[PDB]
Amino acid sequence: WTATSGSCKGRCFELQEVGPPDCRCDNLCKSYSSCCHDFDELCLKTARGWECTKDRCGEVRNEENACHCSEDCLSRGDCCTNYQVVCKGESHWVDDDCEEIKVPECPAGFVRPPLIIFSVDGFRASYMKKGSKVMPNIEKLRSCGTHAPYMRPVYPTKTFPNLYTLATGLYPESHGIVGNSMYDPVFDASFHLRGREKFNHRWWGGQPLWITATKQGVRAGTFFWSVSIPHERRILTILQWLSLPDNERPSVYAFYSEQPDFSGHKYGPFGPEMTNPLREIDKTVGQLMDGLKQLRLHRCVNVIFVGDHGMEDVTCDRTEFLSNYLTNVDDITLVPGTLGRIRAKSINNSKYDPKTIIAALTCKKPDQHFKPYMKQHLPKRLHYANNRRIEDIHLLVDRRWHVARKPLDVYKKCFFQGDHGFDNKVNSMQTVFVGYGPTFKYRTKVPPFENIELYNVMCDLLGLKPAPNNGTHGSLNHLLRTNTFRPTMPDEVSRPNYPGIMYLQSEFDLGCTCDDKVENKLEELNKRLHTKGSTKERHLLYGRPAVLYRTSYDILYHTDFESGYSEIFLMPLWTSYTISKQAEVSSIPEHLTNCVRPDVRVSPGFSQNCLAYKNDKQMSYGFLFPPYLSSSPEAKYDAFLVTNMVPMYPAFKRVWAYFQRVLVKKYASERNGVNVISGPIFDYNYDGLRDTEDEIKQYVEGSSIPVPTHYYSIITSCLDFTQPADKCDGPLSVSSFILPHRPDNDESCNSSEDESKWVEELMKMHTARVRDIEHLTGLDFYRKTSRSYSEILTLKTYLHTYESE
Numbered sequence: 048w049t050a051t052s053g054s055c056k057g058r059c060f061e062l063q064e065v066g067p068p069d070c071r072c073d074n075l076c077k078s079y080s081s082c083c084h085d086f087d088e089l090c091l092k093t094a095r096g097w098e099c100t101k102d103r104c105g106e107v108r109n110e111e112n113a114c115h116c117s118e119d120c121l122s123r124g125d126c127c128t129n130y131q132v133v134c135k136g137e138s139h140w141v142d143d144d145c146e147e148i149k150v151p152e153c154p155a156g157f158v159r160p161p162l163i164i165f166s167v168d169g170f171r172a173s174y175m176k177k178g179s180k181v182m183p184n185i186e187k188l189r190s191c192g193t194h195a196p197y198m199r200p201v202y203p204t205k206t207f208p209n210l211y212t213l214a215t216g217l218y219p220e221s222h223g224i225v226g227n228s229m230y231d232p233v234f235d236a237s238f239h240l241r242g243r244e245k246f247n248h249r250w251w252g253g254q255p256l257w258i259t260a261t262k263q264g265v266r267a268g269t270f271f272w273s274v275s276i277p278h279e280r281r282i283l284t285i286l287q288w289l290s291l292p293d294n295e296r297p298s299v300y301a302f303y304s305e306q307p308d309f310s311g312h313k314y315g316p317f318g319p320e321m322t323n324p325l326r327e328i329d330k331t332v333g334q335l336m337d338g339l340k341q342l343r344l345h346r347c348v349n350v351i352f353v354g355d356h357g358m359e360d361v362t363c364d365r366t367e368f369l370s371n372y373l374t375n376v377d378d379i380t381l382v383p384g385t386l387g388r389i390r391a392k393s394i395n396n397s398k399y400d401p402k403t404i405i406a407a408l409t410c411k412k413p414d415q416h417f418k419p420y421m422k423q424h425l426p427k428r429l430h431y432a433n434n435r436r437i438e439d440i441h442l443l444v445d446r447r448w449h450v451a452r453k454p455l456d457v458y459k460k461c462f463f464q465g466d467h468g469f470d471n472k473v474n475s476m477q478t479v480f481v482g483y484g485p486t487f488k489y490r491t492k493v494p495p496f497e498n499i500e501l502y503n504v505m506c507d508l509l510g511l512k513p514a515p516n517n518g519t520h521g522s523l524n525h526l527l528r529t530n531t532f533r534p535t536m537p538d539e540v541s542r543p544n545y546p547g548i549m550y551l552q553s554e555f556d557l558g559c560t561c562d563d564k565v566e567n568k569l570e571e572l573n574k575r576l577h578t579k580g581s582t583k584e585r586h587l588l589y590g591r592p593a594v595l596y597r598t599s600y601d602i603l604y605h606t607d608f609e610s611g612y613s614e615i616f617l618m619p620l621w622t623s624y625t626i627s628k629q630a631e632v633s634s635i636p637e638h639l640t641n642c643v644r645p646d647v648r649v650s651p652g653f654s655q656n657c658l659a660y661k662n663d664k665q666m667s668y669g670f671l672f673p674p675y676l677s678s679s680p681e682a683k684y685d686a687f688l689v690t691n692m693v694p695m696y697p698a699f700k701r702v703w704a705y706f707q708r709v710l711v712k713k714y715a716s717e718r719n720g721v722n723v724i725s726g727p728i729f730d731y732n733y734d735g736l737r738d739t740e741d742e743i744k745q746y747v748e749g750s751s752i753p754v755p756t757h758y759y760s761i762i763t764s765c766l767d768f769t770q771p772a773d774k775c776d777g778p779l780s781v782s783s784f785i786l787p788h789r790p791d792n793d794e795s796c797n798s799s800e801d802e803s804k805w806v807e808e809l810m811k812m813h814t815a816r817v818r819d820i821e822h823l824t825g826l827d828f829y830r831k832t833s834r835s836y837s838e839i840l841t842l843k844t845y846l847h848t849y850e851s852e
């Protein structure tokens with residue numbers, strides 16, 4: 048019940064919320080159907096429209112007007128945004144040359160530059176260049192302030208997940224808004240765009256910017272706007288709030304436009320109908336900037352122009368139907384569209400089996416436009432598994448396509464030419480970032496970055512301490528003139544042992560053999576130096592990674608590579624090696640095919656054994672430093688050490704061997720040497736975080752050898768590729784992957800073909816940030832470089848997307 052008989056008199060767009068049954072007058076009262084009776088009349092005036100004209104200048108104040116052109120309007124803070132232009136011979140903000148804002152220029156009583164977030168729905172990244180002719184205001188923001196060529200959204204590239212990621216710095220698996228539509232099995236409740244369940248606070252996790260602000264004593268405008276409130280009124284309300292007394296005035300604000308998303312769904316991302324809504328958005332931006340100018344805040348306020356996701360060409364005819372795949376289609380519930388999520392229709396149905404669903408959805412048609420996944424097999428970069436609201440079964444839909452359950456869902460629900468939601472590395476899904484103001488840099492282009500990073504910056508812009516989030520605080524310091532956050536490297540928790548020769552051959556009973564008894568002060572002194580670390584500066588280029596948890600491990604040195612070997616997991620945590628442009632690939636010689644060698648630096652009790660691989664009919668082994676890249680026939684023996692061995696399914700070895708034999712050398716050729724760090728990942732609970740010892744769900748049969756869920760590699764070289772990777776003076780260039788360690792290649796539909804036709808494609812799908820790997824291993828990389836820490840943080844957040852321009 049709402050007792051709507053109260054009044055909005057002097058409360059229009061009030062900031063504190065009144066709970067039921069008291070009628071409300073805030074910017075969301077319409078969405079709750081709870082506004083006071085006189086809200087429209089008093090708060091939503093439209094008389095005479097939104098622009099001053101010559102004949103209105105100096106008019107007698109008339110309180111019925113939507114905005115004012117009388118002399119008192121400035122003191123009142125309620126002039127039309129073009130008032131001074133029309134009546135006082137002032138210029139529009141867009142017609143002024145831009146002039147660096149070297150220091151904040153704010154009216155007295157402003158404790159800090161205010162932040163205004165101008166969010167635009169479905170604003171595709173390429174609109175900045177392609178629509179630049181009809182967007183003069185936005186183009187000036189872009190060219191004069193700080194801009195990125197694009198900003199990467201989070202998956203799924205839908206509205207609620209991304210707007211709430213913006214606000215919180217969190218992955219949707221953490222903040223809880225994992226789609227526009229959701230079922231939560233613990234609540235037994237559904238979240239929908241349509242209806243009232245979505246206003247329930249239980250859905251919304253983490254701590255969004257407005258709460259972070261309020262709690263730390265910084266007032267916030269309310270971020271959300273009921274749809275029916277026109278854009279002009281949104282803008283006039285922000286402007287009015289900004290003329291409140293110092294004690295009452297908020298320091299952070301949000302505007303939101305439904306455009307250009309709304310039209311992009313109807314007309315496609317580039318439909319000729321799309322010009323108008325881009326023009327209209329620009330006009331709205333111009334209104335705000337003119338309004339700030341009038342208030343003397345245009346060189347005081349930080350403005351963020353930001354979008355939530357892009358828009359792709361999608362039409363009804365490009366739909367795949369689960370009914371052409373499954374016998375049991377009526378036994379499932381599908382969340383449909385640009386992504387698919389599948390659960391049982393009834394929890395009482397015991398003939399439901401994900402295994403059979405997955406298989407009936409796997410590589411069934413030549414042209415198949417979606418790929419099914421158990422959520423834990425989704426690329427780790429998507430960070431989309433650790434929430435009960437995400438269904439075990441997921442369908443990754445090709446750009447341009449939909450998935451539905453049955454044809455009747457599509458014609459009985461073309462009506463549309465655009466949509467979004469696809470994989471967040473897809474070009475058409477990328478979106479915009481522009482920062483403009485005293486705290487942002489001047490005419491500066493920054494590289495593309497992820498929207499999860501903005502919350503930290505918005506907090507920095509407001510002098511707030513961010514709630515714990517998935518951004519890497521400091522990685523966006525290069526966007527900022529001042530207010531930087533100067534982080535320190537985490538402290539190493541475990542220090543390595545450095546074992547020498549401690550065991551005789553006969554002490555080992557591992558069931559391994561190697562043809563190495565084929566036997567000198569010249570080279571023996573030299574090869575002892577190798578074991579002691581004489582080549583370590585070549586292969587360990589950016590210092591040893593730090594171990595950020597409590598564990599027991601050894602550093603092991605070799606001619607061609609260096610490792611940190613876990614006595615707890617019985618295999619390296621990381622293996623590091625450098626491959627120069629000139630390095631040469633060799634084969635594994637015949638007499639060494641099955642060679643595995645005890646490591647006399649490491650006890651039998653802390654070693655793997657070959658017997659367990661003999662007995663485990665499912666499991667084979669690979670090596671982290673590849674024997675194919677040994678610097679000499681003698682050095683090659685090191686690569687067959689039991690301490691370089693890791694468990695690998697035969698199907699995964701097809702992948703790994705092709706990476707080691709062909710691709711590493713290729714990257715070394717193309718990039719002028721590369722430094723490689725490889726190792727295992729254990730994430731059995733799919734939380735994006737390293738598993739402890741008591742969380743391992745699978746061992747090589749009979750043994751305590753744990754089976755990795757993933758293998759990673761970090762491939763670093765010189766950004767200035769005219770310098771070799773091992774003699775690089777300046778910035779670095781990195782690409783990484785986290786490959787799922789799977790017993791089959793079902794994910795790659797072309798895998799019966801030669802590795803050259805499908806392995807690199809898999810690795811690109813599984814591209815990762817160094818940061819992703821850090822979360823999964825508890826290691827901290829790049830600890831000793833000549834680069835500043837913020838630059839290193841930026842590098843650690845970089846993702847190599849292999850998407851074209």
Ligand SMILES: *[C@@H]1O[C@H](CO)[C@@H](O[C@@H]2O[C@H](CO)[C@@H](O[C@@H]3O[C@H](CO)[C@@H](O)[C@H](O)[C@@H]3O)[C@H](O)[C@H]2NC(C)=O)[C@H](O)[C@H]1NC(C)=O
Nearest residue numbers: 217218220221222252253254430515516517734735736822
């Ligand atoms: C992304 O950032 C968030 C925020 O730091 C990380 O989520 C947080 O992760 C930890 C460990 O899973 C959670 O700690 C747990 O808290 C509860 C008490 O609420 C307690 O029962 C547990 O014993 C544990 O201490 C924390 O709740 C969680 N917070 C949120 C807001 O989700 C997340 O791990 C980050 N993701 C990645 C991949 O780095």
Ligand SMILES: O=C(/C=C/c1ccc(OC(F)(F)F)cc1)N1C[C@@H]2CN(C(=O)c3ccc4[nH]nnc4c3)C[C@H]2C1
Nearest residue numbers: 164166168206210211213214270271272301302303308
């Ligand atoms: O008032 C807000 C958000 C303000 C805000 C500002 C800053 C925020 O955080 C930031 F400032 F940090 F960005 C967060 C929210 N909203 C967002 C809601 C989207 N919506 C749709 O009907 C809709 C739109 C596109 C679609 N495509 N497909 N289905 C779609 C459905 C209703 C809108 C009300």
Ligand SMILES: [Ca+2]
Nearest residue numbers: 730736737738
């Ligand atoms: Ca884990």
Ligand SMILES: [Ca+2]
Nearest residue numbers: 792793795798
């Ligand atoms: Ca296959």
Ligand SMILES: [Zn+2]
Nearest residue numbers: 168169206355
């Ligand atoms: Zn959206």
Ligand SMILES: [Zn+2]
Nearest residue numbers: 169308312467
């Ligand atoms: Zn949309």
